[PDB]
Structure formats: C-alpha cells, structure tokens
Design a binder for this molecule. Structure first.
Ligand SMILES: Nc1ncnc2c1ncn2[C@@H]1O[C@H](COP(=O)(O)OP(=O)(O)CP(=O)(O)O)[C@@H](O)[C@H]1O
Ligand SMILES: Nc1ncnc2c1ncn2[C@@H]1O[C@H](COP(=O)(O)OP(=O)(O)CP(=O)(O)O)[C@@H](O)[C@H]1O
Ligand SMILES: [Cl-]
Ligand SMILES: [Cl-]
Ligand SMILES: [Mg+2]
Ligand SMILES: [Mg+2]
Lengths: 442, 442
C-alpha cells in the first residue's frame, strides 16, 4: 500500500496533507522551493528535498524534479494538492508511467474533464444537467449559428473548449464577429480554436457537489457548497450546505454526480461545479482534485476528505456508505489572505505576531506562525478560518467572533473584508448570487 | 432574560464563557484582579471592573466586590466558572438575595451536595449507587464501629463529611484510634467532627457523568468522561466516552443521575463523579458547576454546555431531548500547564512565542497569546488541547500530532508529560486506573 508520500505542494494544503499522512502512519517527503525551507510542513516532514529556486515554474511546476524526488526517496505515491500540477494530465501520466501512484484520477479522466466540450458531453451522457447550449462545437455557418443562438435564447456566451477565453453576446447583431473572434483568440493562446455556445445565466449562484469514488466501484456524494461570495472569479467565503437546497434536491443532483463518476471511471475526490439559478442546476466544470474549501464539507458530514483520498489511492474502499452520510449543521470558511483589504495588492512580509482564534466550533487550517515571512512568489493565502454551527446563524456569529480574536501583525490582511461580508444583511439572509461581492464593493 | 453577565472568573474558562455570551448576544462584564488586566477575555469584554489586587483572596474570592460589580453595571447574572466561588453556597445565596441570577444551582442544593454525608443520603434516596459504607455518621462505640467495618470489609476509609481529611484503615487493630484522629482533625480545621466510613476501593477508575437540568422539569445525561489520568489528585488527561462503557450501562447510570437531579431540585450543569471498579459504579461526589474537562463531552455529543448553562439560567428549557443525544466518536483533552514537566513546579513568565496547533478534529481552548505573561498568583493552566476522532485511536494519534506542532517558548510546560502518556502502551489499550500515572512516574 501507501508507505511514503511525496507532498507535491506547499502552504496550507501541504500541511493538511502532512497531517492526514501522519495520522495514517504514512511517511512524508516534502518537496519545496528554496523560498519555502521554513514552511511549517517542511519542518515537520520526515524527509525534505529542494526541487528548485523560488519561481513556481522552476519548482512546484517542475515535473522532472518532483518525479525524481519520489524516485530517490523510494516513495509510493504523490499528492498534488490543489493548483500547481493537480490537474495537469501530463504530470499524472508521467507519475503513473514512472511507477508511482498519483493521488487523483487517471490522466485520461483529467484530460476528459479538462476539455469543456468533452466534459459536457460526458455529463449529458450521465444525466447530469448542463447549460442549454450548442452541444458540441459551433460551425462557421452564421445562419446555423444564428439559429442555435436563437434556440438557446440571448444572451448567450461563446466559450473556448480549451479556455480558462469567453465572450457574452446579447444580440444577433454581434454574433458572427464574436464567434470568429473567440475562435481566433483561442487558437493563438491555446492552439485550440474549438468553441461552443451556451446560455449566459445572468443571476446564478455557485453551488458545487463534493464526490468520492473508489476502485471498488463505489461513489458517494457529500452534499454541496455555496461558493458565490467571490471577487474577480476568486473565492472569498464558502459555506455548506447551500442555503435553499433540500435533502430531496440534494439526493437528486448528488446521485447524478455519483453516477457520472462511475460512468467516466472517476477515482478519488472531485467536485462538480454548477451554476444554480431559478431553482435549477447547470453543470459548468468538474474539478478533478481536492479543493481549498473542502473543510466546510468535512464539518457538516464528518468525513475526512484527504484521508479518504489517501485510502482510495492505496486501493481501499471509501470508509462509509451513502446511507451513512447525513448533513448536520452548517459551516463557513473565510480565506485569510496577506493582501491589502481594499486594493487587494499582495502584502508579503514578516508576521511579527500571530494570534489564532479557538474554542468550540472553530477550526484553523494554516501554515503561518509568528516569525514566519510570507513570500512574494506564490498566492497570498495564509490561513483558512472555518466555523461550525447547528444553524447558519450560529456559524456566522462564530465566524464574526473568531475573526475579532484573530491578530496578524506585520502584514495587511483581508480580515476587514470578511467582517464587512459577515455583517451584510443580504449575506445574513443567505442566497446571494455570484455578482454580489463585486456589486457591494462598487 | 439574560442581557448582561458578570464573568466571575479568569483564564481559559472566562474566555470560554465570554465566547458563549457573545454568540448569544449577551453583554459581558469582566471582573479581574490588577494582575489580570491583560487577560484575553478582559480585552474582549464589553465592560471591565478591577475587583482587587493580585491575590485570589482579595479579588476572585471577594464576594462583596463581585456583587458590587454586578450592581454598578446593572448586570442580570453572574457566571462563577469553576474553582473560585463556584461551589461557595454563601456566594450563591448572596448573589440571589441581591437580585441577580446565579448561573448554577440554588445555594441549598450546593450545600446539600457539599456535605458528603447528606450528598450520599440524597444519592441513595434517588437510586444512584454509592460506595458500601456506614450510611450516616459513625458512633464512638468501637464495638459498633468494628462491626460496621467488618460488614463493609477491610480496607475501609474514614472520611470527614466536611472534608476536602481521609484515613485508610486496613485492620481492626487500627480502627478505634483512626476514627478518633479523623474526628479531631476535621473538628479543628473544619469546625465539623462528623465522619463516616466506607469501603476503600483499591483499583478504581474515575468515571463521571455530565448532566443538565432546567427549570422546566427536564434533566438529561450526556454520556461520561474517564478522568483517571491524574497525579496528586490533579487531572492531566481526560477522555470521553469512557472505555468499556456500553450504551446500555450508560443509559442505566445516566438515567439514575438525571432522576437524582429532579429529586434534589438541581438546576444547571453538573457532574456526578464515580469510582468505577470491577464493572460497578460507586458515587463519590457531585460537582455542582461546569468543569475543566467539559469540552470532551461537547465533542462526542454536539452539545454546547456553557450555552446551555446560560439558557437554563435565563429560564429556558434545555435545547434538546434525551433521545436527541447519541455518542459519536471519541475525544481527548490534555491540560497544558506552565510548569516544569518533571518537578511540576510552576513556570511563570513571558510567552515569547506561542504556536498553537490546528486542523481537522483539533480544538484549542486557551487565553494565552504570544507576548502574554503567565502570572504567579493563580493556577498554572494555560491551555486545553482537545482532539476528536471517529475512534479512540484516531483521537490519540491526533493529540500526539497536535502536541508535536505546539510551541510555547519562554516558559516550561507539561507537554513532555502528555507525550509520554499518549505513547504509553497501557494508556493506548485503555482503561488504566487512577493510580497509573503516579506508578508510571515512580
Ligand atoms: N453559461 C454561463 N453563464 C454565466 N456565467 C458563466 C457561464 N459559464 C461560465 N460562467 C462564469 O465564467 C467564469 C469564469 O470561468 P473560468 O474561466 O474562471 O473557469 P475556470 O473554473 O477553469 C478558472 P477558475 O475556476 O479558477 O476561476 C466563472 O466565474 C463562471 O461563473
Ligand atoms: N471510597 C474510596 N475508595 C478509594 N478512593 C477514594 C474513595 N473515596 C475517595 N477516594 C479518593 O480520595 C481522593 C481525594 O478526594 P478529594 O479530597 O480530592 O475530594 P474533592 O473532589 O472534594 C477535591 P478534588 O476533586 O479537587 O481532588 C480522590 O482522588 C478519590 O479518588
Ligand atoms: Cl481549489
Ligand atoms: Cl473543574
Ligand atoms: Mg473551477
Ligand atoms: Mg471532585
């Protein structure tokens, strides 16, 4: 089985993975850049290897160095975390071909869900609801495209299948030019000109379903998260369960997600992201990896998602059955970033003083410590503050109180932004859409 | 109802109470000594009042100053925490007579359970199992006493009803002298000569049952805790549930405890302490207050014990029914003290650096912060590290890992003692008796 794992990541998620490994008795190899020698998890790991200089391209994205680290330590498996190489199919393929277990899905599945057109096709085949669309790539025949767009109903959005690259079209007046432009933009920067159209949903929430699937033919759904509180497509606050979603609706959408996993040969943790609008779900993407906001799911289900990843990768069955899962209570997560709370410019530097919050229903997932220097080279996340309550109101109040106790001295943080969000009367009512934070911020 | 609470305590429990108050929207008054101006909860409280100089006698035990604080702030209720005045019936009486709600039982109930002979009498009346004993005070008639002692079976222990004062007798040879001595010792230092005898249990565990009782006639039991890991009668590690206790046994003893609450007119949180030996429970004391180790119960039941205290004191019913309570998983607590880990001499001074642990299943209840100075004047507790796991083994491993992440720089702590305990193969098996730690320590 898994005796030794390379943690092919950094920051909080590396520490999260280290904690799960140490609970299971799995030895750890921390691969790190020159700039991350003082990361908490590097300091706690069984073995360490420096895989390159500070820039991500030269280190955390350095496929040969990471594989070489697993080779020299005689590791059995590599955990890619989130970001970095976690949804790089070339990496997954090379890890497996080199004799290691990739803690994630197979490369073929990564590629399948990494292409929007093929992802949507598989979701439709599996009975997962999708955005009404062209259902396949669009022609050049404007007459045909004007006809599909009319069928769908304006506004529509043109999307590059290999994008990550979009264009909203609100009238037929614009369509021909728009489809051509998006085709050309996608072909030069992504060497792939394939685009499709789908309905542009103007008032949606981001609701995403957590799954696990093992090598024993099982697949489970673990309720959902609402991640609508975002700026510039970057999440700020997440919660679980999603307000307004009943157990009956959860069973319906969740079971479809679980069947999709089985149809596509999925293995490990993943998330189906939906836009949720006027009471209906519409698939937009599958993240084929663990996610930042996994803790809110753990809080309301009792599941340890990273431990299950490791089990599954070792060849074990998921450690419970669907009937064992019951949503209990409510959870909130605030992503605490080293950044200016109004300009959102990063704020690297020495944390002179850290005071972290605690007590009943308060969880703190962070690699930051007093005396730690937040480097410039990576993202600005320094901590995830997670609260639990028997109700959403309690979770929210607990989050407010925990934030008020939190002290991070030496750098700016976005704590003031979280405080503003949590006291917002619309957020307190629940169910705001994905545009709310930008609208509120002006 | 309760709009404003005086927190008549300090340290971690004061902060625990402050957190519960703030979640409920209850304003807080922090009464503190001159030495505790920089306590975390004093800094967070709505109002503060200095009630005396450093020594406890002059501050936290200063009944007129505490009552005066409630008077001047127009407070509604006083929470005594644990220790200090929490089981002082004179205090409870004066709080109520002065027009405030005492967050605890009535004085008459405090006094009743504060006297061993009357406590045992009430427990027997209620069907709670007690240590076989003289069942009432012992005479001077040695013939009668030798007869009771014989009935009970040596060894016996002679105990002052007002003690807190004991003497073990292993043969009739010693009995007459022993009963006389304990009588005289109790009369001079406690102005009460009343003593009884009971069986001395040589191989017991400390197993205690948590209850709540409200002013609506309800009383619930919330499983039990095993607090056998102690030195010199001071707890080091506690856990819940107690190893070896089945749900059927739990229902039996728990229901008897709940009926006792109703018979005696109990109100609030309390704990029935038992010695548990060869599969049987024997009552030794009721703590008529919240306890240090309350968190392990919260972790395995989902109950917020301090919030329920406040509800009950406001006149509300307990917020759930007995059938709603189900033990889930296992929890451990390590009392982290500022003391030398081998001599146990206190270690006051400045915490230069604090790094607290986190992640899934890790709870940290502490008022300590980097830059905080641990004073000499009070107890040496600085933090409670609490873990949860689906099994006892997981709780234990999580505790080990959390301790390894914990850094308290500037003072000595008992972390090395906890590490030694957690890796002990007998502790890992579970069920060690109250003498084990002293035996292990040599
Ligand atoms: N049919 C549709 N209607 C309305 N909005 C849509 C939409 N399809 C996609 N979007 C929005 O387009 C935005 C950009 O998607 P994006 O390019 O970020 O994909 P991505 O998930 O691969 C990168 P990331 O998830 O990190 O932001 C998303 O916020 C999504 O909400
Ligand atoms: N019948 C009995 N047989 C064996 N041990 C007994 C016993 N009765 C009491 N003890 C032990 O005597 C010890 C001392 O009790 P103690 O005097 O501390 O009462 P107490 O609870 O009011 C003060 P604390 O709880 O803070 O130690 C306890 O550890 C208890 O385990
Ligand atoms: Cl993510
Ligand atoms: Cl206590
Ligand atoms: Mg996405
Ligand atoms: Mg006691």
């Amino acid at each position: 089985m898994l005796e030794k794992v390379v943690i092919a990541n950094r920051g909080e998620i590396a520490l999260r993975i280290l904690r799960a490994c140490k609970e299971l008795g799995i030895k750890t190899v921390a691969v790190h850049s020159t700039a991350d020698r003082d990361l908490k998890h590097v300091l706690l790991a069984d073995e360490t290897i420096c895989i390159g200089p500070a820039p991500s391209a030269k280190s955390y994205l350095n496929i040969p160095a990471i594989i070489a680290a697993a080779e020299v330590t005689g590791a059995d498996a590599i955990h890619p975390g989130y970001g970095f190489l976690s949804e790089n199919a070339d990496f997954a393929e090379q890890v497996e071909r080199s004799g290691f277990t990739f803690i994630g899905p197979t490369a073929d599945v990564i590629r399948l869900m990494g292409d929007k057109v093929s992802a949507i096709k598989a979701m439709k085949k599996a009975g997962v609801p999708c955005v009404p669309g062209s259902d396949g790539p669009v022609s050049n025949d404007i007459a045909k495209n004007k006809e599909i767009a009319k069928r769908i109903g304006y506004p529509i959005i043109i999307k590059a299948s290999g994008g990550g690259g979009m264009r909203v079209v609100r009238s037929e007046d614009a369509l021909e030019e728009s489809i051509a432009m998006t085709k050309a933009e996608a072909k030069a920067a992504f060497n792939n000109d394939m685009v499709y159209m789908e309905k542009y949903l103007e008032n949606p929430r981001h609701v995403e379903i957590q799954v696990l699937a093992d090598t024993h033919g099982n697949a489970v759904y673990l309720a959902e998260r609402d991640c609508s509180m975002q700026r510039r497509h970057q999440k700020v606050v997440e919660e679980a369960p999603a307000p307004g979603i009943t157990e009956e609706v959860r069973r319906d959408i969740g079971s479809r997600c679980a069947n999709a996993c089985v149809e596509i040969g999925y293995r490990g943790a993943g998330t189906f992201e939906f836009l949720y609008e006027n009471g209906e779900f519409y698939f937009i993407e599958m993240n084929t990896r663990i996610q930042v906001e996994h803790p809110v799911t753990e809080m309301i289900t009792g599941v340890d998602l990273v431990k299950e990843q490791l089990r599954i990768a070792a060849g074990l069955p998921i450690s419970f059955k669907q009937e064992d899962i019951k949503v209990k209570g409510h959870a909130m997560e605030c992503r605490i970033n080293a950044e200016d709370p109004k300009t959102f410019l990063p704020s690297p530097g020495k944390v002179n003083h850290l005071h972290s919050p605690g007590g009943l229903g308060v969880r703190w997932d962070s690699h930051v410590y007093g005396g730690y220097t937040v480097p410039p080279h990576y993202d600005s996340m320094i901590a995830k503050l997670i609260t639990y309550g028997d109700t959403r109101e309690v979770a929210i109040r607990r989050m407010q109180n925990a934030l008020s106790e939190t002290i991070i001295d030496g750098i700016k943080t976005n704590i003031p932004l979280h405080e503003l969000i949590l006291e917002d009367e619309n957020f307190q009512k629940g169910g705001t859409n994905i545009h709310y934070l930008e609208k509120k911020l002006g």
